[PDB]
Design an enzyme around this catalytic site. Sequence first.
Site, PDB file in Angstrom:
ATOM      1  N   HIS A 175       1.722   2.164  -3.572  1.00 50.29           N
ATOM      2  CA  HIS A 175       0.524   2.745  -4.168  1.00 50.29           C
ATOM      3  C   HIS A 175       0.277   4.172  -3.722  1.00 50.29           C
ATOM      4  CE1 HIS A 175      -0.446  -1.602  -4.732  1.00 50.29           C
ATOM      5  NE2 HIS A 175      -1.111  -1.172  -5.809  1.00 50.29           N
ATOM      6  N   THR A 188       0.833  -1.219   0.000  1.00 48.70           N
ATOM      7  CA  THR A 188       0.000   0.000   0.000  1.00 48.70           C
ATOM      8  C   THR A 188       0.864   1.264   0.000  1.00 48.70           C
ATOM      9  OG1 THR A 188      -2.088  -0.807   0.953  1.00 48.70           O
ATOM     10  CG2 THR A 188      -1.523   1.479   1.430  1.00 48.70           C
TER      11      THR A 188
HETATM   12  N1  NAP Z   1      -8.246  -6.626   2.820  1.00 43.31           N
HETATM   13  C1  NAP Z   1      -7.347  -5.913   3.520  1.00 43.31           C
HETATM   14  O1  NAP Z   1      -7.715  -5.293   4.531  1.00 43.31           O
HETATM   15  C2  NAP Z   1      -5.883  -5.892   3.077  1.00 43.31           C
HETATM   16  C3  NAP Z   1      -4.843  -5.568   3.956  1.00 43.31           C
HETATM   17  C4  NAP Z   1      -3.531  -5.572   3.506  1.00 43.31           C
HETATM   18  C5  NAP Z   1      -3.239  -5.883   2.181  1.00 43.31           C
HETATM   19  N2  NAP Z   1      -4.240  -6.177   1.331  1.00 43.31           N
HETATM   20  C6  NAP Z   1      -4.045  -6.575  -0.076  1.00 43.31           C
HETATM   21  O2  NAP Z   1      -3.758  -7.972  -0.137  1.00 43.31           O
HETATM   22  C7  NAP Z   1      -2.951  -8.280  -1.277  1.00 43.31           C
HETATM   23  C8  NAP Z   1      -1.647  -8.942  -0.850  1.00 43.31           C
HETATM   24  O3  NAP Z   1      -0.838  -8.036  -0.085  1.00 43.31           O
HETATM   25  P1  NAP Z   1       0.704  -8.454   0.197  1.00 43.31           P
HETATM   26  O4  NAP Z   1       1.188  -7.335   1.057  1.00 43.31           O
HETATM   27  O5  NAP Z   1       0.823  -9.900   0.604  1.00 43.31           O
HETATM   28  O6  NAP Z   1       1.184  -8.204  -1.305  1.00 43.31           O
HETATM   29  P2  NAP Z   1       2.184  -8.964  -2.282  1.00 43.31           P
HETATM   30  O7  NAP Z   1       3.546  -8.985  -1.627  1.00 43.31           O
HETATM   31  O8  NAP Z   1       1.863  -8.287  -3.565  1.00 43.31           O
HETATM   32  O9  NAP Z   1       1.610 -10.447  -2.324  1.00 43.31           O
HETATM   33  C9  NAP Z   1       0.854 -10.880  -3.430  1.00 43.31           C
HETATM   34  C10 NAP Z   1       1.640 -11.999  -4.050  1.00 43.31           C
HETATM   35  O10 NAP Z   1       0.750 -12.769  -4.843  1.00 43.31           O
HETATM   36  C11 NAP Z   1       1.585 -13.562  -5.686  1.00 43.31           C
HETATM   37  N3  NAP Z   1       0.903 -13.769  -6.967  1.00 43.31           N
HETATM   38  C12 NAP Z   1       0.817 -12.893  -7.999  1.00 43.31           C
HETATM   39  N4  NAP Z   1       0.102 -13.470  -9.003  1.00 43.31           N
HETATM   40  C13 NAP Z   1      -0.272 -14.706  -8.610  1.00 43.31           C
HETATM   41  C14 NAP Z   1      -1.050 -15.839  -9.165  1.00 43.31           C
HETATM   42  N5  NAP Z   1      -1.581 -15.757 -10.405  1.00 43.31           N
HETATM   43  N6  NAP Z   1      -1.216 -16.957  -8.416  1.00 43.31           N
HETATM   44  C15 NAP Z   1      -0.706 -17.058  -7.183  1.00 43.31           C
HETATM   45  N7  NAP Z   1       0.000 -16.058  -6.611  1.00 43.31           N
HETATM   46  C16 NAP Z   1       0.248 -14.890  -7.257  1.00 43.31           C
HETATM   47  C17 NAP Z   1       2.939 -12.844  -5.818  1.00 43.31           C
HETATM   48  O11 NAP Z   1       3.982 -13.704  -5.324  1.00 43.31           O
HETATM   49  P3  NAP Z   1       4.690 -14.688  -6.427  1.00 43.31           P
HETATM   50  O12 NAP Z   1       5.563 -13.664  -7.091  1.00 43.31           O
HETATM   51  O13 NAP Z   1       5.398 -15.732  -5.623  1.00 43.31           O
HETATM   52  O14 NAP Z   1       3.521 -15.242  -7.238  1.00 43.31           O
HETATM   53  C18 NAP Z   1       2.798 -11.612  -4.959  1.00 43.31           C
HETATM   54  O15 NAP Z   1       3.994 -11.435  -4.209  1.00 43.31           O
HETATM   55  C19 NAP Z   1      -2.726  -6.952  -1.981  1.00 43.31           C
HETATM   56  O16 NAP Z   1      -3.702  -6.875  -3.001  1.00 43.31           O
HETATM   57  C20 NAP Z   1      -2.955  -5.925  -0.902  1.00 43.31           C
HETATM   58  O17 NAP Z   1      -3.424  -4.723  -1.455  1.00 43.31           O
HETATM   59  C21 NAP Z   1      -5.525  -6.191   1.769  1.00 43.31           C
END
Ligand code: NAP
Lengths: 342, 342, 342, 342
Positions: free
Chosen positions: D45, D42
């Site tokens: 972003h 975030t």
């Molecule tokens: N709901 C809420 O309150 C909340 C809170 C915090 C964050 N979020 C959100 O949650 C999401 C994850 O956050 P994060 O901090 O963990 O981000 P991140 O580091 O972007 O983790 C997402 C990971 O998903 C993997 N990925 C990408 N494409 C994929 C696919 N087709 N299949 C399987 N895995 C895939 C990638 O790892 P690989 O490169 O190993 O595939 C990427 O590192 C983001 O969208 C963020 O905005 C939401």
Amino acid sequence: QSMMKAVRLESVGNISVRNVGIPEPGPDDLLVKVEACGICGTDRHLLHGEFPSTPPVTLGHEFCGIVVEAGSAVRDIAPGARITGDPNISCGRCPQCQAGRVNLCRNLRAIGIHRDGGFAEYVLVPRKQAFEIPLTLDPVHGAFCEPLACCLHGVDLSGIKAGSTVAILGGGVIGLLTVQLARLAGATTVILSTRQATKRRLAEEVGATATVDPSAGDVVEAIAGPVGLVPGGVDVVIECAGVAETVKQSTRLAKAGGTVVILGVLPQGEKVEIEPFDILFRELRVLGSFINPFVHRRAADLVATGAIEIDRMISRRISLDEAPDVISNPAAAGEVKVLVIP
Amino acid sequence: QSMMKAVRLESVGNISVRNVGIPEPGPDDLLVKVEACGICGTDRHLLHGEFPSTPPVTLGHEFCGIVVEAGSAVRDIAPGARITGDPNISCGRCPQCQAGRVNLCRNLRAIGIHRDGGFAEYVLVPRKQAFEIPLTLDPVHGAFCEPLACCLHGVDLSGIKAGSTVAILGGGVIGLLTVQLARLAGATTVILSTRQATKRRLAEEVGATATVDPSAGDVVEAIAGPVGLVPGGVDVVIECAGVAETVKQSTRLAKAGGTVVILGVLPQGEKVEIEPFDILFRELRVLGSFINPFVHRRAADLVATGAIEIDRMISRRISLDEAPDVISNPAAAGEVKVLVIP
Amino acid sequence: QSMMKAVRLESVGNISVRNVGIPEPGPDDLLVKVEACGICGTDRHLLHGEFPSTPPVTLGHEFCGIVVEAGSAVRDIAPGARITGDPNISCGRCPQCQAGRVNLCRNLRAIGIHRDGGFAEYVLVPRKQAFEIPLTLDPVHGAFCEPLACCLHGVDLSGIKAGSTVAILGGGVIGLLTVQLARLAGATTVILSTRQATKRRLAEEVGATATVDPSAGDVVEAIAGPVGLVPGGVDVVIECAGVAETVKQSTRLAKAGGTVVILGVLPQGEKVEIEPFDILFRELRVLGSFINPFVHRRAADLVATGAIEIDRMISRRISLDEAPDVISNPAAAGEVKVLVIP
Amino acid sequence: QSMMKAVRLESVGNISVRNVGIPEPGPDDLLVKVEACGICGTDRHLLHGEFPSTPPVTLGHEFCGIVVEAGSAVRDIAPGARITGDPNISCGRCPQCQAGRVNLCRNLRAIGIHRDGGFAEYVLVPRKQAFEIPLTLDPVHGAFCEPLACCLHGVDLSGIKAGSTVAILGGGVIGLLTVQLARLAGATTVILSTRQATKRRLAEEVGATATVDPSAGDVVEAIAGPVGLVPGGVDVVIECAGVAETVKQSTRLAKAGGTVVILGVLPQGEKVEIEPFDILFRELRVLGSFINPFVHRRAADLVATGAIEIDRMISRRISLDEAPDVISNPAAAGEVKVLVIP
Ligand SMILES: NC(=O)c1ccc[n+]([C@@H]2O[C@H](COP(=O)([O-])OP(=O)(O)OC[C@H]3O[C@@H](n4cnc5c(N)ncnc54)[C@H](OP(=O)(O)O)[C@@H]3O)[C@@H](O)[C@H]2O)c1
Ligand SMILES: NC(=O)c1ccc[n+]([C@@H]2O[C@H](COP(=O)([O-])OP(=O)(O)OC[C@H]3O[C@@H](n4cnc5c(N)ncnc54)[C@H](OP(=O)(O)O)[C@@H]3O)[C@@H](O)[C@H]2O)c1
Ligand SMILES: NC(=O)c1ccc[n+]([C@@H]2O[C@H](COP(=O)([O-])OP(=O)(O)OC[C@H]3O[C@@H](n4cnc5c(N)ncnc54)[C@H](OP(=O)(O)O)[C@@H]3O)[C@@H](O)[C@H]2O)c1
Ligand SMILES: NC(=O)c1ccc[n+]([C@@H]2O[C@H](COP(=O)([O-])OP(=O)(O)OC[C@H]3O[C@@H](n4cnc5c(N)ncnc54)[C@H](OP(=O)(O)O)[C@@H]3O)[C@@H](O)[C@H]2O)c1
Ligand SMILES: [Zn+2]
Ligand SMILES: [Zn+2]
Ligand SMILES: [Zn+2]
Ligand SMILES: [Zn+2]
């Protein structure tokens, strides 16, 4: 005529091993060669007429085994399969059943109570009551699916989740399975109260974070008091003893906003005092939990994946011939579960 | 110095109308000219020290009125708006509050108990406690949002839904509002038990499908017995009397699988007997319901849309000067709600 | 050999009235002389092979009637009783069934689809599928218990409670029964969107507080927009049309924190766009609702107590001989429910 | 004038370390000397204006530290205490807030977005946003309470319980914390899909029972297909990637009757296809999960009791001066969480 041993409750007070015919299955039944059947404290009550039954009848409602014959209408489980049996047969046509409250069926019949059960070389299990489990499993582990399913229903009702604090009252097999299910459901404090040292130590080997001895002092102060384990009370109390004292302590152990689940069976007509002011002002939930509605498959899967410790729960393994004596006498000192192996 | 009448609880036992200054609002307060404040049975308890309080203090916690001054930090409700007040101020920083259980706040303060309340020409209402309602409404209707919100929380807990059967024990204002909320939540049988004829007739005008008189015979048999109104018990029992007898009957009126909700306040320390065998074998839920967490807006909207009958609930309208006498004496025969109009 | 008329789906596209033998019941069946069977839009789909079936088969799955013969194993419902039938037979032995998700049975068989149904003078109903209703009732009212039960399951899923605001998309029989169930469950705003004037007027006679015409302008702005009926969205949207447009509008009608329930059947494989950002940031729930698990008794009781308006839902009453033509053609202009009376 | 370093987002695109005054607390604030603040995706972003903010502002919303000054109105947490901060400040006066949906507050302000945050030597934390944790803890562990609380809310919504089967899509910090919370909530199969080997191996060290690589073949067949890990689908899918592909696969991985929880943030306005026929006929639940309503205390307690593995989640520890570069560039290969230590 091919025969088998069966532990039969002839009538109130009268229990012995007898030779009976091997039953032949109707079209929707399985005939199961029993690998293990557990003895329950309910079995002692059944003997002395404290719970009803339809004697003469083969006792035993905690069993698993190998399917040796299928009825003509059964097509999805064949001879060779291992199954555990849900002993509680619901009718499907009364209002409780049609509302999905199958444990509250007004026509409920239990294998080992109203029908011949698992303290025998073979047992008839209607297909709907049969839950398949892996052949690779320890042969006796399936016998725990029934008491585990009762505990799982209680834990579901309780709302235990990640980070919950929990007190369990009573260290029999139900309490100890409940300790394990509490940890698995995410409780990070799980306190077990029981008078026997051996059972407190076992509780700690299977997941209790602490134990208390109600002989040694006021359990309510030890757990919930200002300098207790969890000052102000736990999220969830599960009463697993079935005695007036634990039912009575349960609400005072709960924090404000907490839940009490009653798993323990107190004798019919026996009365215990509550304080309605406290139930209201501290917004408590007091919930009865009765047997195993729609949880048997999940229970069977927990045993199948090895998520539950079963081996430490087995205190003894006995023969059919030894069963009448063990059932006729009170449980031994550190006794958790006795398995009958035919 | 501009003055006003206020009904002040000087100390335990001492209540009278006094002249006090019109309060001046802090930056997050509204000053509200009271259109109506209801008298509660809690107000009698407060007078005789049966519930705690911080005297001297203006009583009254069931009120609505017109905003006449806003504090400098208040920007979304202006002078001229009508509001109803939630009297229960939670702290937002204790563990109950941080878990969302704001009704269980350990630092709870109530307007009309620990702070000056609505039996006065003007009352200070912190903005977060103020709920805007239409100017087109009958001026006194807002005074019901508080007791309605307590009943709505109870009905939410009960699980009443389309087709439920319900028994309500006690025909005071809580019972009668609960009859109405039971019908609105979809109950198709709503039975009210109360000893006064006048209150049974009123119950029938506001939604009860039947009523019973506990003087006339065994209420448990009349409702749940083989030839009663609902043989085998109702889905939901809501206890609204706060006496040992109704608490005690509640579980025997419930069907197997049913719910009891305790709204009634029984004196602290007073004990009532339950039968744990029955709670278990009939898988009952016994739930305490305490005040109004997150339901005030919904309650205000029910009154705003006219979904609740309020006018038949008002037994009498009195002046500030008449309040000390009405509060100091027991309620009159058919009395439901007395409104103080300044 | 005693004969009867039956409306038979001979095979995909081929439907006619034929003479067949009166079926003879197995030991757990009831033989029911049909008083009414409703025609469903599913029946048109079945005719054109859009839903599967096992032709040749008597259609009709929305029926009630008088028991004229009981099988030898049936002992609690006798000849003379009136029943409504649950057409959905679950197996009780698959994993969905053992988890209590009987509507998701992988071996599901429906009366009127895989078994001979209610467009005949007589129909076989297995006892577990039979729900007794009063003889004093209007003879055709029981035919509504099945579609009502589907709507009740949807309303249960939705969380509608006292004070909820609700939009219903589609003014067929499901939408209109849902309007009524929404009001009964406590919704104080119930808005129905449908293109036909006649169906909007009927919606208002059976509980809708407002109606909107999607031909006349943007429904999303009319309902949820800044100067719409409920600015910011409703608590609950129930999609009852089964077309891409209503599925697509559903989430934009919901307030933040709201629920969408999908009752409408969109053709298999057809795709609709959602915006996952909005689902997340506005914390929506999107829930599928499939048939009638454990709600049939409640549905039968709602009809038995007269809580639902049924008579205004009947557009026409036809004979068996007229059924093939009505089923083979699209529904008429203001058509809600057509009843087949044998 | 006493100064400190702060990582300041000057305006969209412009980020650097600057010297600012140490803030002085209002009467309800704590001044906290930061021990650690985590960098979130975030934060990238926010830099590029993809999420809104009120520049200029100190970034950082995942922090813990030692209270060094309390405001005059704060009386229950003193200097010396360690706290973790909930960055999400809700207003308590809008309709979402009054309904208890504090995460949906329409006036939401976040520390590190609309107010100066934790990438600085000191940070102001209003008392209600401060959660006390043990001094005996590893100093950096508190920085995980915020992302853990987001995951815990998602896991609560999902219904995961003892014996559930679970697929998690995306192996960032959210996915990996969710693997751990899934196991703690009782899931006995927890499958994680992610393209990086290093992150699959880490998933297995912190609780995943299996992992899959979506580069290596069809993930839907690998998990849910006839010869996949869990033929027929899992109970719960948690989408943690925030890309169109994982959102799109989610429903096809779920068994009939299953739940999809959307944690991942897909760019506003971006559209993904669902199949409403499948949602209905397989009675799915699709649930958005947004931030951390009423779960922060539980999250803090999980970290305090050591129920969560935190150390393996820390990929790197950097200084304030290094932060602008790490935030301005995309994440490194195996990167999970980068901690800023002032
Ligand atoms: N709901 C809420 O309150 C909340 C809170 C915090 C964050 N979020 C959100 O949650 C999401 C994850 O956050 P994060 O901090 O963990 O981000 P991140 O580091 O972007 O983790 C997402 C990971 O998903 C993997 N990925 C990408 N494409 C994929 C696919 N087709 N299949 C399987 N895995 C895939 C990638 O790892 P690989 O490169 O190993 O595939 C990427 O590192 C983001 O969208 C963020 O905005 C939401
Ligand atoms: N709800 C259901 O569906 C269900 C199913 C199965 C069984 N049950 C019931 O659950 C209860 C437990 O069954 P079980 O098989 O585990 O029986 P058990 O072997 O009798 O276990 C109960 C244990 O409670 C302990 N206990 C007694 N008084 C105590 C006290 N004051 N404080 C703490 N612990 C105390 C005893 O161990 P110590 O000697 O160490 O104190 C006793 O062994 C029984 O009432 C049984 O009927 C219910
Ligand atoms: N949970 C909460 O948040 C909350 C909020 C407000 C009030 N309360 C409590 O709720 C209770 C009712 O309040 P209220 O203002 O309606 O008081 P109320 O006017 O005292 O109503 C109770 C009524 O119960 C009836 N009753 C007494 N004994 C009975 C019996 N054996 N069977 C049936 N009915 C009986 C009486 O009417 P008859 O003379 O006609 O029998 C009495 O008027 C009180 O205990 C009050 O403290 C709780
Ligand atoms: N989930 C279940 O278990 C279950 C059970 C039974 C039926 N169903 C399904 O539920 C749906 C409704 O069944 P029904 O028997 O009521 O069918 P119906 O008679 O087809 O009702 C649907 C109505 O929706 C209206 N409509 C069409 N487009 C619209 C739009 N854009 N906006 C608003 N309204 C629109 C039409 O009326 P106007 O011409 O007035 O617009 C049409 O009559 C069908 O998809 C059916 O398959 C589901
Ligand atoms: Zn039954
Ligand atoms: Zn508080
Ligand atoms: Zn099935
Ligand atoms: Zn807000």
